[PDB]
Design a protein around this ligand. Structure first.
Ligand SMILES: CC(C)(COP(=O)(O)OP(=O)(O)OC[C@H]1O[C@@H](n2cnc3c(N)ncnc32)[C@H](O)[C@@H]1OP(=O)(O)O)[C@@H](O)[C@H](O)NCCC(=O)NCCCC(=O)C[C@@](O)(CC(=O)O)C(=O)O
Ligand SMILES: CC(C)(COP(=O)(O)OP(=O)(O)OC[C@H]1O[C@@H](n2cnc3c(N)ncnc32)[C@H](O)[C@@H]1OP(=O)(O)O)[C@@H](O)[C@H](O)NCCC(=O)NCCCC(=O)C[C@@](O)(CC(=O)O)C(=O)O
Lengths: 379, 381
């Protein structure tokens, strides 16, 4: 019978990403994400790694960035797929609308060894363009496109905010990009894999992945976690809130728990370090951080023994808030998606190119036995 | 944790009360009712929608009310219509539906999973799917926007609005049957993608968007166009065996509209579609020609592939029925008409999963990539 939540079912092999959930170890193509972050690698180097299977030389990187910046120009109708929507709309749903627009108009897309990586590189560029325009629309600003610059992170932040981002902001965004690049087969990547396993196009695969990312149990926690801290308002109030909501109210502690990690999420640890550093400079944000660390202590004491620990989404919102993004319209989840689009595409290409099979499971029937079609009077 | 469940074959992802399939004997029941018995009995598509949302056939009272809720979906906001019409006219019809539903996912800020309201939301969305699909068809054909209106039937409301003229009783009855036949099929790739999305507690409209994403592909709902496109390519019945040997038997391509993950015999829906395709196409000689190519190719296919349990599926004949009704072969329109029907099953499954057996869907992969290695700075590579 039933493989609930597909727990421990292997749906593919991958060369892209390994996770040890018991030791809390995450590697991208053999490199620890700690090593990548310490090194100061640019996010484009890690995008290249995902698409090509190795780190690029300076020459390969120059070539790659040129392909990504092709995506910074997007059709007027893709922008308009966003802006023609109401402003109170969820930021991720807005990204879905825009990607659905390309799914629709890219009539020539074909799965092909020779073109897949270039389509994917250009799409990483368009995700930046779409995410800029999602943020501008929500904030009721003019439409704008990212421009080529020293970095993908800088290009994104400069177009989103319409000012020059500082070095510290750019470096934090660059790390955010790397930390959310991929995580093997979470619900979002799985939904996308199901879509591309019918040989539906890359963009539809992204659209499905976004539909799943949106939910509070997955990437939607990037907004729901920080919303808990915002409710608490005052650190003195933490214990009471925690007993009221979590111990006595049976609600889940958002930003804790993971299907795979039964220990502290190694990405959460890095995000926590950045949150502490970036927030301390901003009094309103610093106090959100303080609430979060007090709450975390209670959570770990209550849940640690069940293998339920902070995940990435517990701290990533504070990182985004400190960079300058507001807590509204699930913006934080849209920022997760911007990063994750690289891992989604790399997985879909690996799946379709090398181990293609329709994904089509079964259900256990527990409904009514065969019965004769009843006429209306006798019902 | 070393073996790979390839395509999740025979993995059970949920329990269901809704639909049962016997793959070896070729039996499909909805809520205990055989699809053959449903069609023979003259069920209205609205009765089967109700069946899916509520678990039994409706009394005359329940049905009148249900139909009113559905018709509320016929009024859709102008930005949902515009999500379709601002796209290039050359776009895939299913991807236009996806654009329109994503627009709803964006704007339905108040949606919440709730046993009290799920079924009314789902009923209204079935009306909205009719309005969306009308407008996709209209945009493709460069016609003005239009909304369906209440009539004696959901199928009639749809056809009248799509074509801008009164549908005949024959057309209506064919569409009504196509709506029932495509309602649900347990957990195909589309339903599965949607279930994954809703397992995160994402909203119903996002679940439908993910399902549309998957249905579009040619190994799934895209076959409804790809199979009939084979018949269109062959063009001359004398040429069928030649085509089949050049394209299929040499291993160049799969025979579209044959084969199934579950059925290892003739699809019971395909038997029904075949009977209708024959009756309706015989009234239009240019379409009858298509049907005659199809049945000639079908005979070669079953002789070649029958022993492997590869038989006609639903998509082999469905394009012919839609063509006979008046829908052209272009822009994946036949797949959009599949989606029109299947939205009922999708929602009914999502509701059953979230309400009664909710759990995040989150599998694993087997790692076969590079062993642990030290990061090398870019200057030294
Ligand atoms: C859904 C899940 C993430 C994982 O849970 P599972 O589906 O593996 O386990 P489950 O739902 O069956 O729960 C098992 C038990 O553990 C409890 N539980 C699990 N998480 C809890 C929590 N956070 N608080 C309280 N109880 C929690 C749960 O109630 C239940 O208790 P009982 O029914 O046995 O009483 C939960 O921890 C939980 O809902 N977390 C809160 C929401 C949240 O923070 N989500 C963010 C997760 C991180 C992300 O989405 C990003 C991600 O890492 C995801 C990925 O890789 O999968 C990525 O990079 O793509
Ligand atoms: C994908 C599948 C539907 C099912 O195949 P599986 O994924 O179960 O198996 P597979 O791809 O692993 O194939 C098994 C073998 O059978 C061969 N094969 C299978 N179908 C074939 C075909 N149609 N033509 C030629 N060869 C075919 C295949 O090459 C392979 O050969 P070997 O490598 O063993 O030598 C295939 O039959 C095939 O692609 N069909 C053609 C496209 C097509 O008509 N698809 C429409 C299916 C109908 C629908 O999508 C609607 C659906 O019923 C779907 C549902 O319920 O699942 C619904 O209601 O939602």
């Amino acid at each position: 019978e039933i493989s609930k939540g597909l727990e421990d079912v292997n749906i593919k092999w991958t060369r892209l990403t390994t996770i040890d959930g018991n030791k809390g170890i995450l590697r991208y193509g053999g490199y620890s994400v700690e090593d990548i972050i310490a090194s100061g690698a640019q996010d484009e180097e890690i995008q290249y790694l995902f698409l090509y299977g190795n780190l690029p030389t300076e020459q390969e990187l120059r070539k790659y960035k040129e392909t990504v910046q092709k995506g910074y120009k997007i059709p007027d109708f893709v922008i308009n797929a966003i802006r023609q929507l109401p402003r109170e709309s969820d930021a991720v749903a807005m990204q879905m609308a825009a990607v659905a627009a390309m799914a629709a108009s890219e009539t020539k897309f074909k799965w092909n060894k020779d073109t897949d990586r270039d389509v994917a590189a250009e799409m990483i560029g368009r995700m930046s363009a779409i995410t800029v325009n999602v943020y501008r629309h929500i904030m009721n600003m003019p439409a704008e496109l990212p421009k080529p610059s020293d970095s993908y992170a800088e290009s994104f932040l400069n177009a989103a905010f319409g000012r020059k981002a500082t070095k510290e902001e750019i470096d934090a965004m660059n790390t955010a990009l790397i930390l959310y690049t991929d995580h093997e087969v979470p619900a979002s990547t799985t939904a996308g894999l199901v879509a591309v396993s019918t040989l539906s196009d890359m963009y539809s695969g992204i659209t499905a992945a976004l539909a799943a990312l949106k939910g509070p149990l997955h990437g939607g926690a990037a907004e729901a976690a920080i919303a808990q801290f915002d409710e608490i308002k005052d650190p003195a109030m933490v214990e009471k809130w925690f007993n009221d909501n979590i111990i006595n109210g049976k609600k889940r502690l958002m930003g804790f728990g993971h299907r795979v990690y039964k220990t502290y999420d190694p990405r959460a640890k890095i995000f926590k370090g950045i949150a502490e550093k970036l927030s301390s400079k901003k009094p309103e944000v610093h106090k959100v951080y303080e609430i979060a660390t007090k709450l975390e202590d209670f959570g770990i004491k209550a849940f640690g023994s069940k293998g339920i620990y902070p995940n990435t989404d517990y701290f990533s919102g504070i990182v985004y808030m400190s960079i300058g993004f507001p807590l509204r319209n699930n913006i934080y989840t849209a920022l997760f998606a911007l990063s994750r689009v690289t891992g989604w595409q790399a997985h879909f290409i690996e799946y379709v190119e090398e181990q293609q099979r329709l994904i089509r499971p079964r259900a256990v029937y527990v409904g009514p036995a065969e019965r004769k079609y009843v006429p209306i009077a006798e019902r």
